[PDB]
Write an enzyme that holds these catalytic residues in place. Structure first.
Site, mmCIF file in Angstrom:
data_model
loop_
_atom_site.group_PDB
_atom_site.id
_atom_site.type_symbol
_atom_site.label_atom_id
_atom_site.label_comp_id
_atom_site.label_asym_id
_atom_site.label_seq_id
_atom_site.Cartn_x
_atom_site.Cartn_y
_atom_site.Cartn_z
ATOM 1 N N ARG A 13 14.387 -10.196 64.097
ATOM 2 C CA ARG A 13 14.274 -11.082 62.934
ATOM 3 C C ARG A 13 13.311 -12.259 63.207
ATOM 4 O O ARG A 13 12.475 -12.629 62.384
ATOM 5 C CB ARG A 13 15.622 -11.658 62.565
ATOM 6 C CG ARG A 13 15.576 -12.332 61.169
ATOM 7 C CD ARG A 13 16.924 -12.877 60.698
ATOM 8 N NE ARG A 13 16.730 -13.825 59.608
ATOM 9 C CZ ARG A 13 17.300 -15.065 59.622
ATOM 10 N NH1 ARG A 13 18.158 -15.523 60.568
ATOM 11 N NH2 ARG A 13 17.018 -15.903 58.643
ATOM 12 N N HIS B 97 9.976 -13.280 61.100
ATOM 13 C CA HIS B 97 9.820 -14.568 60.434
ATOM 14 C C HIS B 97 8.599 -15.370 60.900
ATOM 15 O O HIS B 97 7.981 -16.089 60.129
ATOM 16 C CB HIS B 97 11.103 -15.353 60.654
ATOM 17 C CG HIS B 97 12.159 -15.106 59.594
ATOM 18 N ND1 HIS B 97 12.917 -16.029 59.007
ATOM 19 C CD2 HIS B 97 12.466 -13.888 59.008
ATOM 20 C CE1 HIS B 97 13.656 -15.440 58.090
ATOM 21 N NE2 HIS B 97 13.384 -14.153 58.098
ATOM 22 N N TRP C 223 25.078 -4.007 57.709
ATOM 23 C CA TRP C 223 24.600 -2.936 56.829
ATOM 24 C C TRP C 223 25.092 -1.540 57.225
ATOM 25 O O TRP C 223 24.955 -0.537 56.514
ATOM 26 C CB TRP C 223 23.067 -2.895 56.801
ATOM 27 C CG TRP C 223 22.362 -4.124 56.203
ATOM 28 C CD1 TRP C 223 21.953 -4.139 54.891
ATOM 29 C CD2 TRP C 223 22.005 -5.276 56.879
ATOM 30 N NE1 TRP C 223 21.330 -5.290 54.731
ATOM 31 C CE2 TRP C 223 21.332 -5.996 55.875
ATOM 32 C CE3 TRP C 223 22.119 -5.799 58.161
ATOM 33 C CZ2 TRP C 223 20.773 -7.243 56.127
ATOM 34 C CZ3 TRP C 223 21.558 -7.051 58.401
ATOM 35 C CH2 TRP C 223 20.884 -7.760 57.403
HETATM 36 C C1 HEM Z 1 12.502 -8.771 51.229
HETATM 37 C C2 HEM Z 1 12.629 -8.707 52.683
HETATM 38 C C3 HEM Z 1 13.653 -9.277 53.455
HETATM 39 C C4 HEM Z 1 14.692 -10.168 53.106
HETATM 40 C C5 HEM Z 1 15.030 -10.881 51.792
HETATM 41 C C6 HEM Z 1 15.487 -10.242 54.225
HETATM 42 C C7 HEM Z 1 16.691 -10.956 54.286
HETATM 43 C C8 HEM Z 1 17.603 -11.088 55.345
HETATM 44 C C9 HEM Z 1 18.738 -11.870 55.313
HETATM 45 C C10 HEM Z 1 19.283 -12.633 54.105
HETATM 46 C C11 HEM Z 1 19.282 -11.767 56.590
HETATM 47 C C12 HEM Z 1 20.556 -12.453 57.095
HETATM 48 C C13 HEM Z 1 20.328 -13.646 58.011
HETATM 49 C C14 HEM Z 1 21.627 -14.267 58.527
HETATM 50 O O1 HEM Z 1 22.504 -14.606 57.741
HETATM 51 O O2 HEM Z 1 21.814 -14.429 59.726
HETATM 52 C C15 HEM Z 1 18.480 -10.855 57.274
HETATM 53 C C16 HEM Z 1 18.665 -10.400 58.595
HETATM 54 C C17 HEM Z 1 17.852 -9.586 59.404
HETATM 55 N N1 HEM Z 1 16.664 -9.144 59.002
HETATM 56 FE FE1 HEM Z 1 15.889 -9.304 57.088
HETATM 57 N N2 HEM Z 1 14.983 -9.533 55.234
HETATM 58 C C18 HEM Z 1 13.849 -8.977 54.790
HETATM 59 C C19 HEM Z 1 12.998 -8.204 55.590
HETATM 60 C C20 HEM Z 1 13.143 -7.895 56.958
HETATM 61 C C21 HEM Z 1 12.194 -7.199 57.712
HETATM 62 C C22 HEM Z 1 10.794 -6.857 57.191
HETATM 63 C C23 HEM Z 1 12.732 -7.154 59.017
HETATM 64 C C24 HEM Z 1 12.243 -6.629 60.224
HETATM 65 C C25 HEM Z 1 11.065 -5.814 60.463
HETATM 66 C C26 HEM Z 1 13.977 -7.767 58.938
HETATM 67 C C27 HEM Z 1 14.903 -7.822 59.993
HETATM 68 C C28 HEM Z 1 16.167 -8.404 60.020
HETATM 69 C C29 HEM Z 1 17.082 -8.273 61.047
HETATM 70 C C30 HEM Z 1 16.982 -7.377 62.286
HETATM 71 C C31 HEM Z 1 18.141 -9.105 60.694
HETATM 72 C C32 HEM Z 1 19.408 -9.326 61.521
HETATM 73 C C33 HEM Z 1 19.544 -10.720 62.110
HETATM 74 C C34 HEM Z 1 20.824 -10.983 62.912
HETATM 75 O O3 HEM Z 1 21.683 -10.111 63.061
HETATM 76 O O4 HEM Z 1 20.982 -12.085 63.423
HETATM 77 N N3 HEM Z 1 14.194 -8.281 57.705
HETATM 78 N N4 HEM Z 1 17.469 -10.476 56.515
#
Ligand code: HEM
Length: 291
Positions: free
Chosen positions: A45, A49, A188
């Site tokens: 993540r 970002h 998820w």
């Molecule tokens: C429209 C695109 C995206 C949105 C709105 C989005 C949104 C989110 C949100 C709301 C979280 C939760 C954060 C938290 O509460 O800790 C999250 C987690 C995460 N996202 Fe996304 N994301 C997007 C695209 C992506 C992409 C492109 C990747 C990676 C190539 C990605 C990888 C991850 C991963 C691995 C987490 C897990 C973080 C953790 O467990 O601490 N995301 N995302």
């Protein structure tokens, strides 16, 4: 703006493989974080970002400058929770002070995918730290409460097409959402620190229900205890995205191949590589090294 990659002086493959091994060994060692999910998911993540601020129109943002070390970016509300990944990396940076910030944050992301048994991601060195006034403003990262038209338009800014967007979104099979960070809660899928196409399989096979969570935000919930963001559920609402989701649910290998290319492109957007620069490195995992 032109950002030209400059290899850290005198370094080669062997040097970057030591920094990979240092991250992978600490990922193994610090296994207790986030109820034993470990640090792998917050590190991919963080790599997304620091790259996801790029704008193809004037070449601002992106991974090159490593501007997330500066307060304006580190305190972006969209980056809530990523301080955990930055503090994991801080001892590795003190041990290898010659690596640039951009290179360490993107290599943290490559390392985590490979160590969570995902595809190999070719990676190129040479990001150079730039000054605090080059820090992009807050607000370039995506909202979660939107639809397919929004996701498509948003990712056009990072020069990503529909296949690249659906492949990139497969990373949400990792880790989970945390109510105090984003206002959403839950995982998820069942395998949250193993890289797989399970996200696509869950999206097509679970019975989803639109509910409201404790932060008063809507999200899709399944009887198995899994959740999907509005922007994730989008992928089965749109006809173009749904055909690619169905392709990746029926072919793990094609998903691994397409993710690898799109994740390397994400991390390299905005960077000019001189024709005499080295080739992309492919690092070996600890397991392939017997470590
Ligand atoms: C429209 C695109 C995206 C949105 C709105 C989005 C949104 C989110 C949100 C709301 C979280 C939760 C954060 C938290 O509460 O800790 C999250 C987690 C995460 N996202 Fe996304 N994301 C997007 C695209 C992506 C992409 C492109 C990747 C990676 C190539 C990605 C990888 C991850 C991963 C691995 C987490 C897990 C973080 C953790 O467990 O601490 N995301 N995302």
């Amino acid at each position: 703006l032109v950002h030209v990659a400059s290899v850290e002086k005198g370094r080669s493959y062997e040097d970057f493989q030591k920094v990979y091994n240092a991250i992978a060994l600490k990922l193994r060692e610090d296994d207790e974080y986030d109820n034993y999910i470990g640090y792998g998911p917050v590190l991919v993540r963080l790599a997304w970002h620091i790259s996801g601020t790029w704008d193809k129109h004037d070449n601002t943002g992106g991974s090159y400058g490593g501007t997330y070390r500066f307060k304006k970016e580190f305190n972006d509300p969209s980056n809530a929770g990523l301080q955990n990944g930055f503090k994991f990396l801080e001892p590795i940076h003190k041990e290898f002070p010659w690596i640039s910030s951009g290179d360490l944050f993107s290599l943290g992301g490559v390392t985590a995918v490979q160590e969570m048994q995902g595809p190999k991601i070719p990676w190129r060195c040479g990001r150079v730290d730039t000054p605090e006034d080059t820090t992009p403003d807050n607000g370039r990262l995506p909202d979660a409460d939107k639809d397919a038209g929004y996701v498509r338009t948003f990712f056009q800014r990072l020069n990503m097409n529909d296949r690249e967007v659906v492949a990139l979104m497969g990373a949400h099979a990792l880790g989970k959402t945390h109510l105090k960070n984003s206002g959403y809660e839950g995982p998820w899928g069942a395998a949250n620190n193993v890289f797989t196409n399970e996200g696509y399989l869950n999206l097509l096979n679970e019975d989803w229900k639109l509910e409201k969570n404790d932060a008063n935000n809507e999200q899709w919930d399944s009887k198995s205890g899994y959740m999907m963001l509005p922007t994730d559920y989008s992928l089965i609402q749109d006809p173009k995205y749904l055909s690619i989701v169905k392709e990746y649910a029926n072919d793990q290998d094609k998903f691994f191949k397409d993710f690898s290319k799109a994740f390397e492109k994400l991390l390299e957007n905005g960077i000019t590589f001189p024709k005499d620069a080295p080739s992309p490195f492919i690092f070996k995992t600890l397991e392939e090294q017997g470590l």
